[PDB]
Design a protein around this ligand. Structure first.
Ligand SMILES: Cc1cc2nc3c(=O)[nH]c(=O)nc-3n(C[C@H](O)[C@H](O)[C@H](O)COP(=O)(O)OP(=O)(O)OC[C@H]3O[C@@H](n4cnc5c(N)ncnc54)[C@H](O)[C@@H]3O)c2cc1C
Ligand SMILES: Cc1cc2nc3c(=O)[nH]c(=O)nc-3n(C[C@H](O)[C@H](O)[C@H](O)COP(=O)(O)OP(=O)(O)OC[C@H]3O[C@@H](n4cnc5c(N)ncnc54)[C@H](O)[C@@H]3O)c2cc1C
Ligand SMILES: O=C(O)c1ccc(O)cc1O
Ligand SMILES: O=C(O)c1ccc(O)cc1O
Lengths: 391, 391
């Protein structure tokens, strides 16, 4: 088979790129290692920047989101007794964020794709990229036990952190930057009403906790935990008791608890690869960079890379300007580092780190006191949180 | 002899407190270990917050400063090729800083004191504090070889980091927070015209450099250096060559060099003691806390502690409200930690640290890019730099 753009990975990055391109006339084929169910079993993210909200509208897949998503105008930081609310709308100059599950976005995109009739190959094994630097690169894979070959002009590696794309670029061409945090997040999904109409990030001496939601009757909660913990050690009971111990008494007493639908530990990391492309291979989403979940930037950066890739591919195709694709990494990396800096900051001020001397404890507390107390301070949080402007 | 408030140390803290009190009718005696010349041989600081500028006016010692001091409305950060200017006046809402040597402030205060006839004992050896918790504490010292005793109601420890005051409080009552930086500043004073009308803080791969001034024909320059360097290894030649290598080419080529009047290495530290008082002993200035020089907060915090002490002593004396002196530490520490946080931030973004992995290099560079590029960002620098409001 042959196509124009081969897309490896059917996650939000891949499906979104595929929908944008297809809608513009550029044919694409998506290859996915797993089954649709497996992809749809991932809970993960739930906060979307306005820029991605508009990209979804542009991809023409927003009916359900415009209906079920929730528009939040403020978020709350709880520390040392107090609870401070950041007014995102007025501090950012009219911008807000939308709460709508990553699973929902994926479900919506998958629905739009199936209906469009565009090609999608699930259970495509042993994917391999070939001739990344020629005018005619190709992709090989196995479906059942047959080795197929797909010819294309470009390949978009949207296969996540453990994908085959990044591994296909000679190690000597890539420069890696990385930070691993000594803790993870134990998340829990429950069919109970959320404890607050907006999110609550809480810094507590026992560690970080996060009060989030997915809908009016569906909550998502997290608590920081050591990398040494295993999810089977944390029963629902233990989670609720632990969560309550880390929240403001007034919040803890309003909490409707319940049996978990899903529970899992996600470790924290920071990772950036430079550049994000090789020949006719362009990386997007987690294939190129990972951010700790604290600032909610993962899914959002995936969306911005894709927005950039889609728009450079449009020019190259319809306007015959293939020279523009060379600046892909430069454009994306400016936003990526800004988002990595913010995610890192949020993570350092809200989490309890092991082996922290007295001075750094005091500085972390004061960082909060200054930023949550100064108008200029709150503004740096707001503009970064709603999302910096797409360039 | 007997007095009302005994002041240990004739540095800016001690002289300023002494001038404020004397002007209000409260008698004080200053005890200084060294000679006036020795005190006047210290170059040190040169940047004053507006709040201290007004305190000097209030101490009635501002004629010379109002004449020779320089009012700056902006400062410059140089990094990775570019030079960014922070407009302090408009970003802070009309505030500015004044450049006037610490040596000048001291000289001015010493002049005002001598003329007032208020008591000052230089070369007062073996100072010892006694009965810190009784209604009648006292101070003993040696002048020549005679052991004298001075009776007072209160003692203000303004004797700096290596003073006797802090050592006089039982170790078990004090909680210490401390950070030592792996580098120092090699400063150099020259009788040459400054290279810029405003200050230039420069981050360079070889380390930090600072372009400052004292007057239109007197410059003060610094370069970060390892704690292992000795000032005799750095000849004027080497300093100038090194300074030039760290500055923007356009700035380096305008630099008028010359023989040094003074040269020295100041190490970097962060230190805070809690509380700042014991019985009838109140600590002020470097006796209670030290900040790295990056944010120019040392002399300025000394001034704010003193302003607070002076105003609580006024009430206790003329208004008979001695209960107010109990809240001295609480008031001072709010400003102190905010200033320590800022000084620490400035220091981490402008200096080159040893053993920094690739990720942190990238984050430091982006911190600069974000803060120097965002309006909210520049504003956090401006309001902190001109000085946060006295509470
Ligand atoms: C375990 C995990 C937990 C997360 N949790 C959070 C969280 O709690 N909150 C938050 O804000 N963010 C979270 N994130 C980040 C956010 O979910 C991701 O940024 C987002 O999923 C990235 O989108 P993507 O399309 O790049 O990658 P992914 O969603 O990972 O999709 C990549 C797709 O590629 C497919 N694939 C991989 N290898 C191959 C191959 N060789 N051949 C073919 N197909 C392949 C994978 O099966 C997958 O479908 C999480 C990410 C991960 C991985
Ligand atoms: C070496 C050094 C370099 C500095 N460099 C800079 C710089 O480059 N830029 C900048 O912005 N800031 C700098 N600072 C900080 C700033 O100069 C200080 O914050 C400021 O001097 C503090 O004022 P002070 O009155 O508390 O203490 P000091 O100026 O230290 O005065 C304390 C006084 O107490 C006297 N004394 C001490 N012990 C006794 C005793 N037991 N009995 C009697 N008298 C005693 C001392 O002789 C001294 O006169 C520097 C400080 C130091 C110590
Ligand atoms: O899942 C969420 O709802 C969520 C919300 C905010 C955040 O920072 C991280 C998260 O995973
Ligand atoms: O001495 C100066 O002029 C000076 C100026 C700014 C600063 O941060 C530190 C300093 O010592």
């Amino acid at each position: 088979m042959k196509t124009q753009v081969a897309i490896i990975g059917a996650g939000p990055s891949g499906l979104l790129l595929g929908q944008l391109l297809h809608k513009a006339g550029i044919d694409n084929v998506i290859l996915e290692r797993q089954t649709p169910d497996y992809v749809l079993g991932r809970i993960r993210a739930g906060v979307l920047e306005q820029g991605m909200v508009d990209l979804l509208r542009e991809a023409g897949v927003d009916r359900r989101m415009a209906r079920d998503g929730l528009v939040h105008e403020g978020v709350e930081i709880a520390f040392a007794g107090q609870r401070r609310r950041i007014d995102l709308k007025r501090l950012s100059g009219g911008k807000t964020v939308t709460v709508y599950g990553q699973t929902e976005v994926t479900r919506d995109l998958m629905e739009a794709r199936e209906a469009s009739g565009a090609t999608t190959v699930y259970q495509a094994a042993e994917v391999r990229l070939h001739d990344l630097q020629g005018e005619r690169p190709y992709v090989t894979f196995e479906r059942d036990g047959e080795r197929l070959r797909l010819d294309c002009d470009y390949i978009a590696g949207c296969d996540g952190f453990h994908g085959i794309s990044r591994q296909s670029i000679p190690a000597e061409r890539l420069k890696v930057f990385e930070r691993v945090y000594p803790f993870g997040w134990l998340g829990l999904l429950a069919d109970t009403p959320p404890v607050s109409h907006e999110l609550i990030y809480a810094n507590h001496p026992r560690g970080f906790a996060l009060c989030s939601q997915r809908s009016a009757t569906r909550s998502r909660y997290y608590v920081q935990v050591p990398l040494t913990e295993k999810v089977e050690d944390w029963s629902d009971e233990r989670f609720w008791t632990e969560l309550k111990a880390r929240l403001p008494a007034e919040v803890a007493e309003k909490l409707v608890t319940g049996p978990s639908l899903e529970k899992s530990i996600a470790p924290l990391r920071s990772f950036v690869v430079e550049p994000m492309q090789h020949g006719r291979l362009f990386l997007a989403g987690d294939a190129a960079h990972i951010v700790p979940p604290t600032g909610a930037k993962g899914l959002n950066l995936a969306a911005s890379d894709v927005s950039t890739l889609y728009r450079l591919l449009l020019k190259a195709y319809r306007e015959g300007r293939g020279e523009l694709l060379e600046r892909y990494s430069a454009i994306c990396l400016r936003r990526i580092w800004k988002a990595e800096r913010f995610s890192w900051w949020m993570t350092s001020v809200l989490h309890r780190f092991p082996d922290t001397d007295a001075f750094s404890q005091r500085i972390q507390q004061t960082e909060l006191e200054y930023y949550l107390g100064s108008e200029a301070g709150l503004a740096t949080i707001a503009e970064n949180y709603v999302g910096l402007p797409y360039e």
